[PDB]
Amino acid sequence: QEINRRVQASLASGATLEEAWSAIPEKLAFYDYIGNNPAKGGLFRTGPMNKGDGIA
Amino acid sequence: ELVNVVDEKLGTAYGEKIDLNNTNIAAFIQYRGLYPTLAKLIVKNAPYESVEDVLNIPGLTERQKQILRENLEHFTVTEVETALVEGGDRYNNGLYK
Amino acid sequence: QGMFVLPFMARLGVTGSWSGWSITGETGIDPGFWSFEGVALAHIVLSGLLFLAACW
Amino acid sequence: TLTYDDIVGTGLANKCPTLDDTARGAYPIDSSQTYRIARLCLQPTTFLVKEEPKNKRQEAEFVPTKLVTRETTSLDQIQGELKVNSDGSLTFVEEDGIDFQPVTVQMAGGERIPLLFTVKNLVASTQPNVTSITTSTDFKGEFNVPSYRTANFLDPKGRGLASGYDSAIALPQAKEEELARANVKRFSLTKGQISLNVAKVDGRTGEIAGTFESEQLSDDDMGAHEPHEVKIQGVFYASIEPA
Amino acid sequence: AELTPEVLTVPLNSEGKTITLTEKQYLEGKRLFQYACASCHVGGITKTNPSLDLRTETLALATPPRDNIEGLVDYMKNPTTYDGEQEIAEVHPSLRSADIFPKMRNLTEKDLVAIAGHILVEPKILGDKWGGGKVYY
Ligand code: CLA
Ligand code: CLA
Ligand code: HEM
Ligand SMILES: CC1=C(/C=C/C(C)=C/C=C/C(C)=C/C=C/C=C(C)/C=C/C=C(C)/C=C/C2=C(C)CCCC2(C)C)C(C)(C)CCC1
Ligand SMILES: [Ca+2]
Ligand SMILES: [Cl-]
């Protein structure tokens, strides 16, 4: 929702689609990924999140 | 480079029309007058180089020819795909309701 | 292949498996009971019988 | 004359008919007459698999195997046109019948080799000028070997060609490239070869029997691995008829 | 929502005429469909040939058209394949084959009309469930 808000504000101010999305911090996009949702694990899937989907 | 041949075929006319060379026989229920009599004759006499060649099946009645002519716009032909015609799959492709 | 007991079985005439192979590279041989597997099983059963005798 | 109740559970249903030792006659071919094989039967007695070359790249041999799928191996009730060609050779054009059997044989050491033992779409021809079918007649030809599994077959992870997942869903974030061969199912279609050697002919009834040897590829698991080369040997029976 | 006269209003023929069934005819139709047809046609499908269902759109494209009372009543007397090409009374329940399908022996013309009306009304109630099979259960 916040990502979309920011993109719409960029577009409203005259940015191109490429520019609007390029202005989204990588840190914000990363929170919008289910691999970082804590309800996606397994009891015996041991270790860091990096051991699963990999090091981002 | 490995390809799923059925998915690939869905991007041809096979994905848009009844392919006289490949489509399973139940597809002919879609249009008036084709099933089961003509459907059986069509599958039995496949493959066809062109759609109009379906009109050349021996023994047809004039009525049958006319039904075929009215339905050519719903037919296509593409290369025979082994995966779709083996296993007697044109007659029963493992799909019911 | 780091085989230690296999050569001792082979040295005295145990050369085939119940699975059909022989250490000389033959196929479709029937080794009878005294395959490598039969030898192993015989030793396990002997172990058990000696264990029971020890208890007595 | 044996009934189903005489045969059931004996193993005889998987055997081809035999002809006795007196059947060494000749069956005349009238080149003006049309003919059919009303029944072709093939009973395999041995399955041989070509060992995969160690890397010496000498001649890899065909080795014996153990049948594990029981008395379920024979091809039978096969019928087709027997054409008389202009040079006097005969050509059998297989039309229909129980013309395939899945078969699993096991190599020494346990490797199981499934194959679709088949003569699907067999076109087999004799030598020229066969004015009679005799114990000197042979048929040689080729057939089609379609994929051992057909397009709906789903692997243990639910993946298939005409149905199923198209990915390894249990490894949601694995790199796809290494798994492409397992994920993308392919449907094999290759050729096999067969020789039929007539050993017995009943001139009066049109019945012939003999030995066969066929060569074909085994199952490739919808493109997941390389097939093996198989050689099948056995006995055959055919009834020739004017039609 | 109610079972209204409009829900109960279905095509009588191919020529634009309708008939409004009574609530009692609807009940009779369900009962008789269950009695004579549901063993194969439960929920609008066909168990012995799932390619052909009792959906209204499907019945409309049948030959002769079967998406009306007359078409269905005629089907129950003299059933045909989907293209009208062969008469199938010998393998499909009908009045003509009441000798070999004994449940058809006590069906009256009135009964056939009730069954026909059931086949047309049910999808108006059930939508995709009618002729949908297990996917829509
Ligand atoms: C509050 C406790 C706690 C929590 C929440 C964590 C959390 C974490 N640790 Mg730490 N850790 C702890 C205490 C804890 N630790 C202790 C006490 C030690 C010393 C052993 C460690 C040493 C440690 C190491 C060396 C590592 C971690 C790592 C991790 C991460 C992976 C966790 C994992 O894979 O677990 C897996 C959990 C399980 C498989 C569940 C175990 C359930 C047991 C076996 C049940 C036993 C049942 C019992 C026998 C039944 C009895 C029945 C009877 C009554 C009848 C995670 C952030 C990993 C990491 O990524 O490091 C950077 C890592 O490498 N931890
Ligand atoms: C019951 C009879 C029996 C038989 C037929 C076998 C057979 C076999 N065993 Mg088993 N075994 C047995 C009992 C038996 N075993 C018992 C009771 C034990 C527990 C001690 C074992 C423990 C055992 C081990 C640990 C191993 C075997 C192994 C083997 C294989 C190789 C044998 C070998 O090289 O011997 C070699 C034996 C000798 C060289 C004997 C030496 C005799 C000394 C020098 C005698 C000296 C004293 C004498 C009194 C001197 C005076 C002599 C006089 C005539 C002048 C062969 C399949 C091998 C194998 O392949 O395992 C799978 C192996 O590693 N066995
Ligand atoms: C009196 C009760 C029945 C009625 C009113 C009825 C109605 C119909 C109708 C209208 C169709 C045509 C479907 C279409 O055009 O889309 C049909 C087809 C069919 N029904 Fe029934 N049916 C009845 C009983 C049964 C029973 C008991 C069976 C099973 C034994 C059955 C099996 C079939 C089959 C196999 C078809 C397809 C026939 C073909 O076209 O080859 N029906 N039925
Ligand atoms: C001849 C021969 C051989 C050999 C053999 C052998 C070597 C044997 C043995 C044996 C043995 C080695 C035996 C044994 C045994 C035993 C026993 C018989 C036991 C017992 C017991 C008991 C009875 C006990 C009891 C008890 C218990 C359990 C617990 C506690 C208490 C009591 C004490 C009561 C061979 C194969 C080469 C080949 C051919 C021939
Ligand atoms: Ca010969
Ligand atoms: Cl449908």
PDB file of N, CA and C in Angstrom, chain D residues 105-167:
ATOM      1  N   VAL D 105      11.881 -55.456 -16.320  1.00  0.00           N
ATOM      2  CA  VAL D 105      12.897 -56.475 -16.089  1.00  0.00           C
ATOM      3  C   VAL D 105      13.967 -55.887 -15.168  1.00  0.00           C
ATOM      4  N   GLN D 106      14.656 -56.759 -14.443  1.00  0.00           N
ATOM      5  CA  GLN D 106      15.624 -56.329 -13.443  1.00  0.00           C
ATOM      6  C   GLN D 106      17.019 -56.878 -13.744  1.00  0.00           C
ATOM      7  N   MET D 107      17.984 -55.961 -13.795  1.00  0.00           N
ATOM      8  CA  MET D 107      19.367 -56.346 -14.048  1.00  0.00           C
ATOM      9  C   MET D 107      20.024 -56.852 -12.770  1.00  0.00           C
ATOM     10  N   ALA D 108      21.121 -57.590 -12.947  1.00  0.00           N
ATOM     11  CA  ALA D 108      21.947 -58.011 -11.826  1.00  0.00           C
ATOM     12  C   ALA D 108      22.304 -56.762 -11.029  1.00  0.00           C
ATOM     13  N   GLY D 109      22.106 -56.832  -9.715  1.00  0.00           N
ATOM     14  CA  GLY D 109      22.369 -55.672  -8.866  1.00  0.00           C
ATOM     15  C   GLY D 109      21.148 -54.810  -8.567  1.00  0.00           C
ATOM     16  N   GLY D 110      20.029 -55.075  -9.240  1.00  0.00           N
ATOM     17  CA  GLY D 110      18.760 -54.446  -8.867  1.00  0.00           C
ATOM     18  C   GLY D 110      18.140 -53.409  -9.786  1.00  0.00           C
ATOM     19  N   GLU D 111      18.918 -52.838 -10.707  1.00  0.00           N
ATOM     20  CA  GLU D 111      18.380 -51.809 -11.600  1.00  0.00           C
ATOM     21  C   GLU D 111      17.177 -52.343 -12.376  1.00  0.00           C
ATOM     22  N   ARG D 112      16.060 -51.635 -12.262  1.00  0.00           N
ATOM     23  CA  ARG D 112      14.842 -52.027 -12.941  1.00  0.00           C
ATOM     24  C   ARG D 112      14.699 -51.258 -14.227  1.00  0.00           C
ATOM     25  N   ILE D 113      14.395 -52.000 -15.290  1.00  0.00           N
ATOM     26  CA  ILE D 113      14.284 -51.457 -16.635  1.00  0.00           C
ATOM     27  C   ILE D 113      12.845 -51.649 -17.132  1.00  0.00           C
ATOM     28  N   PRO D 114      12.004 -50.607 -16.996  1.00  0.00           N
ATOM     29  CA  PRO D 114      10.683 -50.694 -17.621  1.00  0.00           C
ATOM     30  C   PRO D 114      10.794 -50.426 -19.117  1.00  0.00           C
ATOM     31  N   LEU D 115       9.979 -51.123 -19.899  1.00  0.00           N
ATOM     32  CA  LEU D 115       9.875 -50.844 -21.331  1.00  0.00           C
ATOM     33  C   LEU D 115       8.447 -51.079 -21.824  1.00  0.00           C
ATOM     34  N   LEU D 116       8.107 -50.396 -22.912  1.00  0.00           N
ATOM     35  CA  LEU D 116       6.872 -50.663 -23.610  1.00  0.00           C
ATOM     36  C   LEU D 116       7.167 -51.657 -24.733  1.00  0.00           C
ATOM     37  N   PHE D 117       7.087 -52.935 -24.414  1.00  0.00           N
ATOM     38  CA  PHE D 117       7.321 -53.979 -25.408  1.00  0.00           C
ATOM     39  C   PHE D 117       6.180 -53.919 -26.428  1.00  0.00           C
ATOM     40  N   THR D 118       6.513 -53.690 -27.696  1.00  0.00           N
ATOM     41  CA  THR D 118       5.487 -53.318 -28.673  1.00  0.00           C
ATOM     42  C   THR D 118       5.824 -53.651 -30.125  1.00  0.00           C
ATOM     43  N   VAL D 119       4.785 -53.733 -30.957  1.00  0.00           N
ATOM     44  CA  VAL D 119       4.931 -53.761 -32.415  1.00  0.00           C
ATOM     45  C   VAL D 119       3.976 -52.744 -33.056  1.00  0.00           C
ATOM     46  N   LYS D 120       3.643 -51.683 -32.306  1.00  0.00           N
ATOM     47  CA  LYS D 120       2.723 -50.650 -32.790  1.00  0.00           C
ATOM     48  C   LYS D 120       3.120 -50.128 -34.168  1.00  0.00           C
ATOM     49  N   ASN D 121       2.145 -50.123 -35.081  1.00  0.00           N
ATOM     50  CA  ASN D 121       2.339 -49.705 -36.470  1.00  0.00           C
ATOM     51  C   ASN D 121       3.426 -50.516 -37.203  1.00  0.00           C
ATOM     52  N   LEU D 122       3.546 -51.799 -36.868  1.00  0.00           N
ATOM     53  CA  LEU D 122       4.495 -52.673 -37.542  1.00  0.00           C
ATOM     54  C   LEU D 122       4.234 -52.706 -39.048  1.00  0.00           C
ATOM     55  N   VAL D 123       5.304 -52.522 -39.823  1.00  0.00           N
ATOM     56  CA  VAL D 123       5.309 -52.766 -41.270  1.00  0.00           C
ATOM     57  C   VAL D 123       6.466 -53.737 -41.513  1.00  0.00           C
ATOM     58  N   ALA D 124       6.139 -55.005 -41.750  1.00  0.00           N
ATOM     59  CA  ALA D 124       7.159 -56.042 -41.934  1.00  0.00           C
ATOM     60  C   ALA D 124       7.023 -56.720 -43.291  1.00  0.00           C
ATOM     61  N   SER D 125       8.156 -56.920 -43.966  1.00  0.00           N
ATOM     62  CA  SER D 125       8.174 -57.489 -45.318  1.00  0.00           C
ATOM     63  C   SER D 125       9.062 -58.724 -45.424  1.00  0.00           C
ATOM     64  N   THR D 126       8.701 -59.607 -46.348  1.00  0.00           N
ATOM     65  CA  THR D 126       9.490 -60.796 -46.670  1.00  0.00           C
ATOM     66  C   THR D 126      10.476 -60.486 -47.796  1.00  0.00           C
ATOM     67  N   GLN D 127      11.281 -61.483 -48.163  1.00  0.00           N
ATOM     68  CA  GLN D 127      12.093 -61.438 -49.390  1.00  0.00           C
ATOM     69  C   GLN D 127      11.191 -61.439 -50.637  1.00  0.00           C
ATOM     70  N   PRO D 128      11.715 -60.981 -51.796  1.00  0.00           N
ATOM     71  CA  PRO D 128      10.889 -60.995 -53.014  1.00  0.00           C
ATOM     72  C   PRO D 128      10.509 -62.413 -53.454  1.00  0.00           C
ATOM     73  N   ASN D 129       9.546 -62.509 -54.370  1.00  0.00           N
ATOM     74  CA  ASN D 129       9.088 -63.783 -54.952  1.00  0.00           C
ATOM     75  C   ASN D 129       8.747 -64.884 -53.944  1.00  0.00           C
ATOM     76  N   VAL D 130       7.857 -64.580 -52.997  1.00  0.00           N
ATOM     77  CA  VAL D 130       7.396 -65.581 -52.023  1.00  0.00           C
ATOM     78  C   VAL D 130       6.078 -66.191 -52.516  1.00  0.00           C
ATOM     79  N   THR D 131       6.194 -67.165 -53.417  1.00  0.00           N
ATOM     80  CA  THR D 131       5.025 -67.781 -54.055  1.00  0.00           C
ATOM     81  C   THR D 131       4.291 -68.702 -53.087  1.00  0.00           C
ATOM     82  N   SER D 132       5.008 -69.127 -52.049  1.00  0.00           N
ATOM     83  CA  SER D 132       4.419 -69.814 -50.908  1.00  0.00           C
ATOM     84  C   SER D 132       5.147 -69.405 -49.631  1.00  0.00           C
ATOM     85  N   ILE D 133       4.402 -69.299 -48.533  1.00  0.00           N
ATOM     86  CA  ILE D 133       5.019 -69.129 -47.222  1.00  0.00           C
ATOM     87  C   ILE D 133       5.511 -70.493 -46.748  1.00  0.00           C
ATOM     88  N   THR D 134       6.816 -70.586 -46.519  1.00  0.00           N
ATOM     89  CA  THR D 134       7.462 -71.835 -46.124  1.00  0.00           C
ATOM     90  C   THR D 134       8.331 -71.598 -44.892  1.00  0.00           C
ATOM     91  N   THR D 135       8.972 -72.659 -44.403  1.00  0.00           N
ATOM     92  CA  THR D 135       9.885 -72.553 -43.262  1.00  0.00           C
ATOM     93  C   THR D 135      11.163 -71.792 -43.622  1.00  0.00           C
ATOM     94  N   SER D 136      11.189 -71.208 -44.817  1.00  0.00           N
ATOM     95  CA  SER D 136      12.314 -70.393 -45.263  1.00  0.00           C
ATOM     96  C   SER D 136      11.929 -68.923 -45.348  1.00  0.00           C
ATOM     97  N   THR D 137      10.642 -68.637 -45.169  1.00  0.00           N
ATOM     98  CA  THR D 137      10.162 -67.258 -45.156  1.00  0.00           C
ATOM     99  C   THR D 137      10.584 -66.547 -43.865  1.00  0.00           C
ATOM    100  N   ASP D 138      10.979 -65.290 -43.997  1.00  0.00           N
ATOM    101  CA  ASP D 138      11.221 -64.431 -42.847  1.00  0.00           C
ATOM    102  C   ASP D 138      10.534 -63.097 -43.100  1.00  0.00           C
ATOM    103  N   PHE D 139      10.111 -62.437 -42.024  1.00  0.00           N
ATOM    104  CA  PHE D 139       9.576 -61.086 -42.093  1.00  0.00           C
ATOM    105  C   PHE D 139      10.519 -60.163 -41.334  1.00  0.00           C
ATOM    106  N   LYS D 140      10.840 -59.021 -41.931  1.00  0.00           N
ATOM    107  CA  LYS D 140      11.647 -58.007 -41.272  1.00  0.00           C
ATOM    108  C   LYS D 140      10.995 -56.650 -41.453  1.00  0.00           C
ATOM    109  N   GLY D 141      10.951 -55.876 -40.377  1.00  0.00           N
ATOM    110  CA  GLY D 141      10.364 -54.553 -40.454  1.00  0.00           C
ATOM    111  C   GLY D 141      10.558 -53.697 -39.226  1.00  0.00           C
ATOM    112  N   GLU D 142       9.907 -52.543 -39.239  1.00  0.00           N
ATOM    113  CA  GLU D 142       9.993 -51.627 -38.126  1.00  0.00           C
ATOM    114  C   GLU D 142       8.629 -51.256 -37.554  1.00  0.00           C
ATOM    115  N   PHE D 143       8.653 -50.725 -36.335  1.00  0.00           N
ATOM    116  CA  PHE D 143       7.454 -50.329 -35.618  1.00  0.00           C
ATOM    117  C   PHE D 143       7.737 -49.045 -34.824  1.00  0.00           C
ATOM    118  N   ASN D 144       6.680 -48.450 -34.278  1.00  0.00           N
ATOM    119  CA  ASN D 144       6.782 -47.239 -33.470  1.00  0.00           C
ATOM    120  C   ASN D 144       6.843 -47.578 -31.988  1.00  0.00           C
ATOM    121  N   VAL D 145       7.668 -46.837 -31.250  1.00  0.00           N
ATOM    122  CA  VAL D 145       7.778 -47.001 -29.804  1.00  0.00           C
ATOM    123  C   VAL D 145       7.451 -45.644 -29.191  1.00  0.00           C
ATOM    124  N   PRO D 146       6.185 -45.457 -28.781  1.00  0.00           N
ATOM    125  CA  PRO D 146       5.825 -44.210 -28.135  1.00  0.00           C
ATOM    126  C   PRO D 146       6.293 -44.232 -26.680  1.00  0.00           C
ATOM    127  N   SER D 147       6.321 -43.059 -26.061  1.00  0.00           N
ATOM    128  CA  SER D 147       6.603 -42.925 -24.634  1.00  0.00           C
ATOM    129  C   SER D 147       5.885 -43.987 -23.812  1.00  0.00           C
ATOM    130  N   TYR D 148       6.623 -44.585 -22.879  1.00  0.00           N
ATOM    131  CA  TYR D 148       6.132 -45.644 -21.997  1.00  0.00           C
ATOM    132  C   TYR D 148       4.963 -45.147 -21.129  1.00  0.00           C
ATOM    133  N   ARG D 149       5.081 -43.915 -20.624  1.00  0.00           N
ATOM    134  CA  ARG D 149       3.946 -43.216 -19.999  1.00  0.00           C
ATOM    135  C   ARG D 149       3.318 -42.270 -21.037  1.00  0.00           C
ATOM    136  N   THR D 150       1.993 -42.118 -21.033  1.00  0.00           N
ATOM    137  CA  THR D 150       1.354 -41.145 -21.941  1.00  0.00           C
ATOM    138  C   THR D 150       1.230 -39.785 -21.253  1.00  0.00           C
ATOM    139  N   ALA D 151       0.668 -38.806 -21.955  1.00  0.00           N
ATOM    140  CA  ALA D 151       0.859 -37.397 -21.591  1.00  0.00           C
ATOM    141  C   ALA D 151       0.242 -36.929 -20.265  1.00  0.00           C
ATOM    142  N   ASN D 152      -0.756 -37.655 -19.757  1.00  0.00           N
ATOM    143  CA  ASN D 152      -1.388 -37.334 -18.456  1.00  0.00           C
ATOM    144  C   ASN D 152      -0.598 -37.798 -17.234  1.00  0.00           C
ATOM    145  N   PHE D 153       0.352 -38.706 -17.446  1.00  0.00           N
ATOM    146  CA  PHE D 153       1.087 -39.299 -16.327  1.00  0.00           C
ATOM    147  C   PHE D 153       1.746 -38.253 -15.433  1.00  0.00           C
ATOM    148  N   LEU D 154       1.463 -38.342 -14.136  1.00  0.00           N
ATOM    149  CA  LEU D 154       1.999 -37.415 -13.147  1.00  0.00           C
ATOM    150  C   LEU D 154       3.071 -38.102 -12.315  1.00  0.00           C
ATOM    151  N   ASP D 155       4.207 -37.426 -12.182  1.00  0.00           N
ATOM    152  CA  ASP D 155       5.282 -37.928 -11.340  1.00  0.00           C
ATOM    153  C   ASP D 155       4.918 -37.773  -9.839  1.00  0.00           C
ATOM    154  N   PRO D 156       5.758 -38.320  -8.931  1.00  0.00           N
ATOM    155  CA  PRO D 156       5.402 -38.321  -7.506  1.00  0.00           C
ATOM    156  C   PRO D 156       5.290 -36.932  -6.880  1.00  0.00           C
ATOM    157  N   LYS D 157       5.783 -35.906  -7.573  1.00  0.00           N
ATOM    158  CA  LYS D 157       5.603 -34.528  -7.117  1.00  0.00           C
ATOM    159  C   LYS D 157       4.518 -33.780  -7.901  1.00  0.00           C
ATOM    160  N   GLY D 158       3.693 -34.521  -8.638  1.00  0.00           N
ATOM    161  CA  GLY D 158       2.550 -33.932  -9.323  1.00  0.00           C
ATOM    162  C   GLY D 158       2.836 -33.274 -10.664  1.00  0.00           C
ATOM    163  N   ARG D 159       4.056 -33.443 -11.176  1.00  0.00           N
ATOM    164  CA  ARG D 159       4.468 -32.839 -12.454  1.00  0.00           C
ATOM    165  C   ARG D 159       4.129 -33.724 -13.653  1.00  0.00           C
ATOM    166  N   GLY D 160       3.663 -33.112 -14.743  1.00  0.00           N
ATOM    167  CA  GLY D 160       3.305 -33.867 -15.948  1.00  0.00           C
ATOM    168  C   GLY D 160       3.399 -33.061 -17.226  1.00  0.00           C
ATOM    169  N   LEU D 161       3.073 -33.703 -18.343  1.00  0.00           N
ATOM    170  CA  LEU D 161       3.092 -33.039 -19.649  1.00  0.00           C
ATOM    171  C   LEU D 161       1.749 -32.377 -19.996  1.00  0.00           C
ATOM    172  N   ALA D 162       0.691 -33.175 -20.168  1.00  0.00           N
ATOM    173  CA  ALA D 162      -0.647 -32.629 -20.466  1.00  0.00           C
ATOM    174  C   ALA D 162      -1.441 -32.252 -19.201  1.00  0.00           C
ATOM    175  N   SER D 163      -0.878 -32.555 -18.036  1.00  0.00           N
ATOM    176  CA  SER D 163      -1.485 -32.195 -16.757  1.00  0.00           C
ATOM    177  C   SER D 163      -0.365 -32.024 -15.744  1.00  0.00           C
ATOM    178  N   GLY D 164      -0.692 -31.512 -14.557  1.00  0.00           N
ATOM    179  CA  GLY D 164       0.282 -31.437 -13.474  1.00  0.00           C
ATOM    180  C   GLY D 164       0.948 -30.094 -13.307  1.00  0.00           C
ATOM    181  N   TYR D 165       1.719 -29.952 -12.223  1.00  0.00           N
ATOM    182  CA  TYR D 165       2.513 -28.745 -11.993  1.00  0.00           C
ATOM    183  C   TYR D 165       3.617 -28.642 -13.037  1.00  0.00           C
ATOM    184  N   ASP D 166       4.109 -27.427 -13.287  1.00  0.00           N
ATOM    185  CA  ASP D 166       5.231 -27.250 -14.222  1.00  0.00           C
ATOM    186  C   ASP D 166       6.517 -26.868 -13.486  1.00  0.00           C
ATOM    187  N   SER D 167       6.497 -27.012 -12.161  1.00  0.00           N
ATOM    188  CA  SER D 167       7.661 -26.669 -11.361  1.00  0.00           C
ATOM    189  C   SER D 167       7.765 -27.576 -10.132  1.00  0.00           C
TER     190      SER D 167
END
